[PDB]
Ligand binder design. Structure first.
Ligand SMILES: Nc1ncnc2c1ncn2[C@@H]1O[C@H](COP(=O)(O)OP(=O)(O)O)[C@@H](O)[C@H]1O
Ligand SMILES: Nc1ncnc2c1ncn2[C@@H]1O[C@H](COP(=O)(O)OP(=O)(O)O)[C@@H](O)[C@H]1O
Ligand SMILES: Nc1ncnc2c1ncn2[C@@H]1O[C@H](COP(=O)(O)OP(=O)(O)O)[C@@H](O)[C@H]1O
Ligand SMILES: [Mg+2]
Ligand SMILES: [Mg+2]
Ligand SMILES: [Mg+2]
Lengths: 526, 526, 526
């Protein structure tokens, strides 16, 4: 209904590129360990002085509609990189601006956007392949500490606490980060579990910050079979309502009818309940549900042998947990105080079954169940002096933990933009179909130098000469910005996960192609 | 009572054509499988990046009143093409603009708009005749999948689910699409019925999105005869009100008084009851109501042998259904739970009557009742992560259903704009009355290369040479845009319903004539 | 969401420097004993005539965003100097402007900001080393009076009261400053204690002026162990809310659970409670809690001998104090009227144990234990003629207290600006790495005479010749400005703590580097 202003072709692409140029100029100065300083004017108090690319990026909002939406496009892409891999906002932004500007200048000469995009994406796939083949896995906790410290903007405390948590629980363990009311960060191992199923309907989310649902002292309903009837879930809801506690139900599949009833009941004020799918696809589902029932304390409803009907639900027949955190893909049941003697008996039964037989596939499940029932949940409470400080530190710790998980899962590569510099040689092997694909290959190859050049420039040195030396030098040493010398990157501690570099290059190429190939831009009149 | 600005003749037609030019220029870049990108500025969040022409068209609102109303004219015509055949908004828009601009240029030279319109519609009707001539009837489910997948803008999931639904239920079966709470689309066959009658009065509509009326757990009053007395419908409404369920009545004809009473009680807060014309007119009217009474459950009021008066209405004699969704022309009664033993007995009676005699006109009715009581209603539940996403997905799959129906109702025809490229030869057999009808026929034959040229242009190639090759080549191969090569069109699966092309050409010609012949344009003073 | 203006490099640093120049010019005139006069327009009464630089600084807000944020940066840095040392807002401001202007003029010639900052930091470190090298401690109450009078801008009465309070209590004793209704400042010694542990959660703060929590007639709960259960803190809270009196609890560590419960109880209107950590690291903690229990009157809950479970708390079993002041690192319990006979018995026991054996590390602790109970809190009640001039005078007395504590903590140096003048020979021994670090050394050595020059200029004389005479003169005399002659600076009275000079130089150098090395400045559009 609102009157629009419509711009076509390069007329709109130029303005969008101006917006992305302002964004990338603002966020480029903050890149590296020697990142420059940005002062953001606060409308209520003292100005905010930061060297963080995420804050600088989320800070700017342009007045021009076209510039603002180009900046918003690149900015949301960088946010996606940050939220997916824990790092890469500034790198994705500088790569995106490089690719977009080079593509715009090549297209304005009269080239084909589609062929250039094809060449750019073939180059990107080659680079990602080489960067994956050059990755190395983490083998020692010191590498975990290095990765966490780099991902936390050089914060040694965050790296140390994350490495300690991964030492206590495991590299593939369960670590969570909540707020703390004290003045120093504290590491706590508490009893809890986490399994690879998320909420069926995204309508129970209590918290909009991280697409989570947080509950305190929530009842656990277990039903290994489908809900028999409405008169079988209604008594459980009545019991939960009368017992002043929320409900967390886990079953096979609650999609069509009971899910609709729960969603419509969610609209009621004061009614809280979530649904999660059962963890496994066979005997693992049954034994994991038995483990959860033992750890929570209660009874299992719907068993083939016991034939316990959901209609005859009792307060003592449901599980109990302290804190519930359910996400889109994973669900966390925290502080489940069940029968300790029963938990010990179940542990004894599991360890007795461990030394019975091995099949190379079910023994992995048995070891996993032992780990879930034995290894606690690492909680990293974040302390500070005010709400803003605890929030910012919580975000930094969460992002560092995400980047550490990414390093564990895939591996690590040389930091400081050196990983993308060792990916240049493989662009010689590939051959383009036409001249525009070769133009895209050139665009990408003059782009992998941008992160290292930016980091060196922020260090104060003339980054062109440094990257020339880096390319001339061997494949194990690179340029350090803290010390200002070419050092062996791998053991100096300057390493980042393969995932962040992959995601940054992919996101940058995607948004740059979108910026250089968008034909019509529709904006509301100012 | 508000001051108007009035413009006359070409002075207003020029401005309206400027508006339609901006609309068609913005929506023309998103045409084909290779369609360019429109960045639509959202006022509250990130910009909306889309390649879908219906969204681009919905986005555009001009500031100039005359340009805006020209854009709105072509926009609503394209919307009617969409809502009538589920596909053809961008083609209708580009042909609209082509014909309108060509006729405007031929009329500014001093031609007669009436003679040009006559020639244009002569040409259009010839093209529609040849396009009916070249249609082919779908004969295999893979063609249904191809049609659904094209009509869904290349979504393979929509094509696959629609083909599975039309394999489970049938090509001319009952398929409905409803929202869903889960994260994936699930196909479900649910017991229901649908007949070819719609609500009598368009005042009971609960849903404004689609001229529909949705109910849950509704009563079904049946009276094969007419309502004898008002004291014969007041007790039924009293029972409905006291039994907390919305009545749904089906009589012969309710127009004069009972319908007026129902409409005046509709304005009461919380009163819900709809009337539906009796389904049949002969013996089918006599037996389909028995079928519905057996399905829902209860008794039939007004029989010629049972004399069951409507005054003695009882809660055990009315029908029951789960969902009632009635449209202007058709009505669906979903989840009618009745005596399954009675339904089995009715099916046994029908299959016994099947092998009794054959009349070549009543066997069809027998098999139709067999299918209505046997083939369940396919419901395609649509799930996602946000109300806007589930609404977009619902609209896309609904349009794909409409286009598949349009394909299985009249046939298919070569896609990619080649359908309108093999209708050009027909324009040489006709002969105009005067020179201006020849002018209009030239306009139309020039307009018939515009869809193929637009698709090729969006693919990155020079569409004129491609359409020259298509007209020089044989009558079975056309130009692909995903693979960028001349390929036999029918085998790969580039086919669209002949109805969408027919409707697009008719709609485009109508709005173009209305734009090049309107003489006075009255607009509110800004 | 707010649109921003983003400025880069010198095109922003220049405007920020203009802001800091306006701020420093306005606050520089008020520097010294002979400080000039500033009239500040009061928008409700008569203008405010002041010679005090903190009011002038806090009085200045520029209309331009970039200038205002440069001014605000230097303002907050000067405020930090004033709030962590009690004196040095104007000296820090003038040094900061000097360093920033000189760095800006050297960088605009083409220098490297990183290297200039490195030279500046090495120069500042050398200067601070020599400042620590030339500091002398306080040896008589006369010097306490001198430093208090200088830190109160010449007020002989503030110096006198602070010196008398330090004579009565001690140079390392508890002195506090509250408001009062009389017309003349009065000194009172009252019973109370203070220990080096502050609050655990910064959410109980009733006072927002000085991050304090102020209570009147508050109950004291003691527990030298972890809270047994919620079923033992609930009765405590019930007792506290039944006897119409707040609670002050001291424990071992209340961070995770009970702290969260006290914070959520802090969110209800009518509930007040604070928590403090245990005072000691061993036997000192136990005996200090014993002393506090005797001084407050009641019982100790949680001993290994008495085993007084926290589930049997009674009103006679809790301690009582008059006024409670809790800060971030310190806690004060004031007017705790316990059993005077029990306090005398405790004092007799302590003085009897003070003659058994000494160990050179626990006799000190015994002295401290006796002093906590024996030395009374010195409260300096401030009063006058209205509400605003009691806040003003209380701020002045508090800042003078802070500077006297800084003097009795590290030492004193030659006032007037000669302290920074005697540190000039330091900068002749250090050697720079390159020419830009020599530029930084020159900047700092030229900056080291700005305060003396400013004080002399405000006196009425050409300060360049005065500082030349001071540098040519012996290392014990310097220019007086209340007399106008070069006098022996040490026995005349003109001395300031080394901590104010050190903090001012650090703060000036830090904000000046920030100002001359900030690359991007983001402000909202006006
Ligand atoms: N000591 C160091 N020397 C060189 N490069 C470093 C050093 N520490 C971190 N880096 C590099 O800094 C880059 C990330 O920093 P920054 O740009 O602030 O964050 P982001 O990952 O959001 O872009 C990484 O590429 C990393 O390799
Ligand atoms: N692979 C393909 N090659 C060539 N044309 C295609 C292909 N897929 C779809 N098309 C054509 O695209 C046209 C429809 O696309 P589009 O313009 O987005 O929708 P609309 O039907 O609303 O105009 C149809 O004419 C169809 O024939
Ligand atoms: N009689 C005096 N002669 C010379 N200098 C003095 C005298 N009294 C105070 N000063 C100097 O004045 C300076 C502090 O005054 P002022 O600038 O008003 O406060 P601030 O410490 O906030 O800058 C100190 O450096 C001190 O040495
Ligand atoms: Mg980072
Ligand atoms: Mg389509
Ligand atoms: Mg002072």
């Amino acid at each position: 209904g609102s009157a629009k202003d419509v711009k076509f072709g390069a007329d709109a692409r130029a303005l969008m590129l101006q917006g992305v140029d302002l964004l990338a100029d603002a966020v480029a100065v903050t890149m590296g360990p020697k990142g420059r300083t940005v002062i953001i004017e606060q409308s209520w108090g003292s100005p905010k002085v930061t060297k963080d690319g995420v804050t600088v990026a989320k800070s700017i909002d342009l007045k021009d509609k076209y510039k603002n939406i180009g900046a918003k496009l690149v900015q949301d892409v960088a946010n996606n990189t940050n939220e997916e891999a824990g790092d890469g906002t500034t790198t994705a932004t500088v790569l995106a601006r490089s690719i977009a500007k080079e593509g715009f200048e090549k297209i304005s000469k009269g080239a084909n956007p589609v062929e250039i995009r094809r060449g750019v994406m073939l180059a990107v796939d080659a680079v990602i392949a080489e960067l994956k083949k050059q990755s190395k896995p983490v083998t020692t906790p010191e590498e975990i500490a290095q990765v966490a410290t780099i991902s936390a903007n050089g914060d040694k405390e965050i790296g140390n606490i994350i490495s300690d948590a991964m030492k206590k629980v495991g590299r593939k363990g369960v670590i969570t980060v909540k707020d703390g009311k004290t003045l120093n960060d504290e590491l706590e191992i508490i009893e809890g579990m986490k399994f690879d199923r998320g909420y069926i309907s995204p309508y129970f989310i209590n918290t909009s910050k991280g697409q989570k649902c947080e509950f305190q002292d929530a009842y656990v309903l277990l039903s290994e079979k489908k809900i028999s009837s409405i008169q079988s879930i209604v008594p459980a809801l009545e019991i939960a309502n009368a017992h002043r506690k929320p409900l967390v139900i886990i079953a096979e599949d609650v999609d069509g009818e009971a899910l609709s009833t729960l969603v419509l009941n969610r609209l009621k004020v004061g009614l809280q309940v979530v649904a999660v799918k059962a963890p496994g696809f066979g005997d693992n589902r049954k034994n994991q549900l038995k483990d959860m029932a033992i750890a929570t304390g209660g009874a299992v409803f719907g068993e083939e042998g016991l034939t316990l009907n959901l209609e005859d639900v009792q307060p003592h027949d449901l599980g109990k947990v302290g804190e519930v955190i359910v996400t889109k893909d994973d669900a966390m049941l925290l502080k489940g105080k069940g029968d300790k003697a029963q938990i010990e008996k179940r542990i004894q039964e599991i360890i007795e079954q461990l030394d019975v037989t091995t099949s190379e596939y079910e023994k992995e499940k048995l070891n996993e169940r032992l780990a879930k029932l034995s290894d606690g949940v690492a909680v990293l409470k974040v302390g500070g002096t005010s709400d803003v400080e605890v929030n910012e530190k919580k975000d930094r710790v969460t992002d560092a933990l995400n980047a550490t998980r990414a390093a564990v899962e895939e591996g690590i590569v040389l930091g400081g933009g050196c990983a993308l510099l060792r990916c240049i040689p493989a662009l010689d092997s590939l051959t383009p179909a036409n001249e525009d694909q070769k133009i895209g290959i050139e665009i990408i190859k003059r782009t992998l130098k941008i992160p290292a050049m930016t980091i060196a420039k922020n260090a104060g040195v003339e980054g062109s000469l440094i990257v020339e030396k880096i390319m001339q030098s061997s494949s194990e040493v690179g340029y350090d910005a803290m010390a200002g010398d070419f050092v062996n990157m791998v053991e100096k501690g300057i390493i980042d996960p393969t995932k962040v570099v992959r995601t940054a290059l992919l996101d940058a190429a995607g948004v740059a192609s979108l910026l250089t190939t968008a034909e019509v831009v529709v904006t509301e009149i100012p």
